[PDB]
Design a binder for this molecule. Structure first.
Ligand SMILES: Nc1ncnc2c1ncn2[C@@H]1O[C@H](COP(=O)(O)OP(=O)(O)O)[C@@H](O)[C@H]1O
Ligand code: BEF
Ligand SMILES: [Mg+2]
Lengths: 417, 331, 417
């Protein structure tokens, strides 16, 4: 039996199934062991089991296949895969596996793998001889990601302004610099909605680290793609675990020539969790920050690139600033000259009920000539030169009034002439 | 106490509720959250239903027998919306969502009315009710149902009724379905023995007039002439016969109360021991036993802590009882 | 128990009441905590409390209802209102609330609101669906405010000259440009007296910022309407607080279709306090003035308008000039082409014991055709053309001698022919 039907189904149908199977009182335990016992019973009376997930290789030698909805956490639902598969198919951490699995006998409790069927949505023969991630040649973004939907809703104008200020492409690095209280959550939500509606072929992934759980549940069923999130409820170990999980999944997917898009929020909280989880190296700056503690976050932000051979990886990680502490400040300083596309959201415009609060004067993107055409770039430069002498709130309201009447950025540009 | 045999828990899952009491002066954990409270579902709608929260609708009542039945009653103060049609969603889409959030409990949106009659009629819907009566002095409602919809009239534990008795706060009465079930004429000519010896001179005067009660005789004994005018012939003999009937009624009510307070019937088969007196046995048998056949099965639990008894006296009485019943085996 | 009876009563009756209640030594503390303890005792032995005031919403989420006599200042007398009311009734800053309140238990010390009764002198049902302030359509003043009382006293002639030089209407902006030593205090006092005697239906509000306290106490009980004043005794924080308080009260009242009239003195001192209270933006001109520091004062002066839907708002803010510093000078330059009715009071005529010192040649009002009739306007223009060739002191004494004999401006006009 397939696994996803029982994973993404509501727990009520699982309770009904477990009560119909004539089992122990099922509703008295976790969803994890509930579905574990359900699979065990269906295997005792039924055929082989069909499971799937993402693979993580420990320092022990074997591998664990974990599901997306549990944010790839340990439990009875994981799938044990012996090192024999890692020697035969030459598996790697983050490999999306799906195949046949069997029940465990004494000495074991996890469902052992029987035969793989789909590895990263590809045949094992094609995946055997492949190219590594770091062995690829990065490049600049050439195909621009169209964020305008075309309907011109009450809030899609935000995305429109984004297209006006930061042309995003396959392989670009986006840093959203915004203090709290500024309204970046719905901004990222609309960005994900538009990028899934306009580009449904490329995989979309979001990551909420140290975030409130209510936002996690309201985003995990509002946008497309698996919404993996590690809320603040758990220690930093789970945060670095899910970070490696998602980064290896993205690396494998882009190695299989797939345009991967990551939405990370926030990066300062992820770096703080990294700082408290990795052992200290002795050297400490102000704010309780270590030297090597930023190495792994840096790597995580540097993984994104535009691959020349096939596919690309575009990360969009937001940096939370203006909190009072020094951790976020030093993180934003270390990541300032890192991303090639910054987007500043000043709270001065946000507190005035003027959304989206976008600091167009301080925002920009490098190498935009490889994403837009000639006259489009000329119009963008003319608009930038016109708006630059203005302030922030006045320029924002002027742009809002000039964009509300029009429905498309092209008509906006020609009417601004 | 707020949990359920079907509502089930183990470390790891997220269960929600409403914080109902906070005791910051306690010794330990003092964030008391419940789930069985009715208004809970109200706030659920507040986070789900867009009609509630803007005052355009008014969620008034909620009858929640946890795990059995969770009905809601709303009212619309505006004149362009419906109470039930907008809140159900689209053929059970949001109501079933909040139901499976509450644990799959059967949720039916009832429409309460400005009067308790239609309120309890709708609370026990879809079903027919042959009689609806309200009683203020008894603080009750008589709901007599007809035959043809029993499968929806009672259900399990009378849930379709159990909500109403829990919503209005009045202990309803759904007992009898045979003749004179209307409760409006169930006392008019069903108990005719009221004027036993009142019209002792003759019998052919007029038709009987029940609209006064014939039984109260406290709001009827001494009243102005304009209230006793329903029957003609209010002379001194008539008022004296009324006073005599009232005195007889007082005596009967006093005897009935004296008999009902002592729900034991203490006969002479109760003071055969040495040391047993009136109030001793009165309390001992008011504790839940009737005769000697049901007292030797206990010990110092019931026979001690009685007015006029010591632990040693209790032990003595209980050993005497066990020797005359358990060790004797005589009848 | 109602709140206003204990607020506007002398402190002596409060001392007597607190001594009769058998309480602690009451006269040893502020009036604020005195009335707080009195209300607490009356609630411990009595019914619910009845309070009222103006609502201010902080950045925290809750709200504080403050009284008018304390210039809406913090203390034990404030009323805490939870955000639940701000979500149910959709409250806003500056809402005039009056309703039932309860005493506080442990963890709290302010009287919590129980049930609102009157919101801005209106039913909550009628106030639910309403129109915003900025969403209204401003217009020119049409109904002229008659300032002549008709008795012709020794000093009301001042007001008469005002009607001769600046026809005021519902929705006009008045800027009194006068150096010190010039006698504007009694001028504004007489203006308020006349506008309350002739138009008692419209609310009248005065505001004394950075003013001497003696004038505050002598004006708070001489004219009608709540006299809210922030004297120089307190820092600029209280000044901007009371500015927002009064402006939001006026906005709510004009949203409820009420003719609001504000008397502000002086505007240069208010702008200076604004300049020192709001953080600097880097750009600084001569005199220690910031660029954005004038934005909030400008807004405050621009709030006044004539609403087409219902009611209007008329502000009369006086600008103090000729002090030596550059702050007042640059403020008067920035506000010169701002108000649509200037009234100049030269000190040259004031120092000569000739009151009212009014520069009729430099005074005027735009769009006066919408406030006066045809022949009245013709007579006004004839008088202006006659007086213009004259100087200042000579014209002032000529006008005084021509107005003292007459009692009404109409007979004055016909006798000037
Ligand atoms: N209508 C008037 N009649 C007589 N004296 C006046 C009149 N108006 C003003 N004054 C005099 O002018 C002086 C102005 O004092 P003050 O109120 O401090 O000036 P300002 O109002 O400019 O601050 C007062 O002392 C008052 O005697
Ligand atoms: F009272 Be003065 F005009 F400062
Ligand atoms: Mg003065």
């Amino acid at each position: 039996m397939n696994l996803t039907e029982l994973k993404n189904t509501p727990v009520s149908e699982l309770i009904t199934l477990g009560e119909n199977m004539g089992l122990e009182n099922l509703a008295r335990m976790r969803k994890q062991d509930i579905i574990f016992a359900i699979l065990k019973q269906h295997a005792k009376s039924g055929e082989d089991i069909f499971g799937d997930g993402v693979l993580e290789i420990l320092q022990d030698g074997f591998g664990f296949l974990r599901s997306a909805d549990s944010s790839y956490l340990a439990g009875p639902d994981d799938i044990y895969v012996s090192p024999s598969q890692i020697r035969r198919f030459n598996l790697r951490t983050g490999d999306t596996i799906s195949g046949k699995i069997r029940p465990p006998k004494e000495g074991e409790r996890y469902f052992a793998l029987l035969k793989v069927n789909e590895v990263n949505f590809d045949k094992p023969e094609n995946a055997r001889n492949k190219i590594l991630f770091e062995n690829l040649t990065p490049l600049h973004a050439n195909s621009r990601l169209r964020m305008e939907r075309g309907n011109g809703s009450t809030e899609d104008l935000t995305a429109r302004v984004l297209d006006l200020a930061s042309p995003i492409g396959r392989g670009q690095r986006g840093l959203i610099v915004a203090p709290p209280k500024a309204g970046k959550t719905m901004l990222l939500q609309n960005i994900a909605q538009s990028i899934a509606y306009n580009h449904p072929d490329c995989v979309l992934m979001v990551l909420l680290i140290d975030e409130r759980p209510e936002e996690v549940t309201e985003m995990q069923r509002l946008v497309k793609g698996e919404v993996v999130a590690s809320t603040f409820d758990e220690p930093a170990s789970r945060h670095v675990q899910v970070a490696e999980m998602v980064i290896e999944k993205a690396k494998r997917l882009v190695e299989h020539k797939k345009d991967v898009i990551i939405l990370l929020d926030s990066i300062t909280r992820l770096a703080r969790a990294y700082n408290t989880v990795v052992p200290a190296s002795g050297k400490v700056l102000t704010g309780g920050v270590d030297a090597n503690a930023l190495h792994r976050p840096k790597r995580f932000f540097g993984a994104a690139r535009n691959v020349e051979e096939g596919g690309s990886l575009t990360i969009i990680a937001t940096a939370l600033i203006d909190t009072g502490s020094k951790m976020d400040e030093v993180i934003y300083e270390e990541f300032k000259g890192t991303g090639n596309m910054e987007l500043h959201l000043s709270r001065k415009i946000a507190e005035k009920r003027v959304f989206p609060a976008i600091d167009y004067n301080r925002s920009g993107t490098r190498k935009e000539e490889l994403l837009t055409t000639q006259e489009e770039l000329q119009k963008m430069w003319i608009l930038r030169k016109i708006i630059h002498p203005m302030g922030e709130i006045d320029a924002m309201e002027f742009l809002i009034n000039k964009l509300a009447m029009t429905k498309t950025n092209d008509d906006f540009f020609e009417m601004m002439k | 106490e707020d949990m359920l045999p079907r509502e089930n828990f183990r470390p790891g899952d997220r269960v929600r509720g409403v914080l109902y009491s906070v005791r910051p002066e306690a010794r330990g954990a003092q964030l008391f959250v419940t789930r069985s409270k009715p208004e809970m579902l109200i706030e659920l709608f507040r986070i789900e239903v867009p009609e509630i929260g803007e005052e355009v609708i008014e969620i008034k009542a909620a009858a929640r027998d946890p795990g059995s039945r969770a009905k809601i009653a709303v009212k619309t103060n505006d004149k362009r919306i419906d109470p039930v049609g907008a809140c159900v969603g689209m053929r059970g889409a949001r109501v079933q969502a909040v139901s499976t959030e509450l644990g799959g409990e059967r949720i039916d949106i009832v429409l309460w009315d400005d009067n308790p009659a239609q309120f309890v009629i709708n609370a026990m819907a879809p079903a027919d009710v042959a009689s609806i009566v309200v009683d203020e002095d008894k603080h009750t409602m008589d709901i007599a149902v007809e035959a043809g919809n029993l499968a929806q009239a009672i259900g399990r534990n009378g849930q379709n009724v159990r909500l109403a008795s829990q919503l209005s706060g009045w202990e309803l009465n759904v007992m009898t379905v045979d003749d004179l079930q209307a409760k409006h004429q169930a006392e008019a000519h069903a108990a005719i023995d009221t004027f036993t010896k009142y019209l002792d001179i003759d019998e052919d005067f007029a038709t009987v007039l029940v609209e006064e009660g014939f039984s109260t005789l406290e709001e009827l004994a001494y009243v102005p002439m304009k209230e006793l005018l329903e029957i003609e012939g209010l002379d001194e003999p008539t008022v004296e016969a009324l006073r005599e009937r009232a005195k007889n009624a007082l005596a009967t009510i006093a005897q009935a109360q004296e008999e009902s307070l002592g729900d034991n019937k203490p006969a002479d088969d109760l003071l055969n021991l040495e040391g047993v007196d009136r109030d001793l046995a009165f309390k001992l048998a008011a504790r839940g036993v009737c005769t000697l056949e049901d007292l030797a099965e206990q010990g110092i639990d019931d026979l001690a802590d009685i007015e006029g008894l010591t632990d040693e006296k209790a032990g003595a009485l209980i050993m005497a009882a066990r020797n005359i019943c358990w060790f004797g085996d005589e009848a």
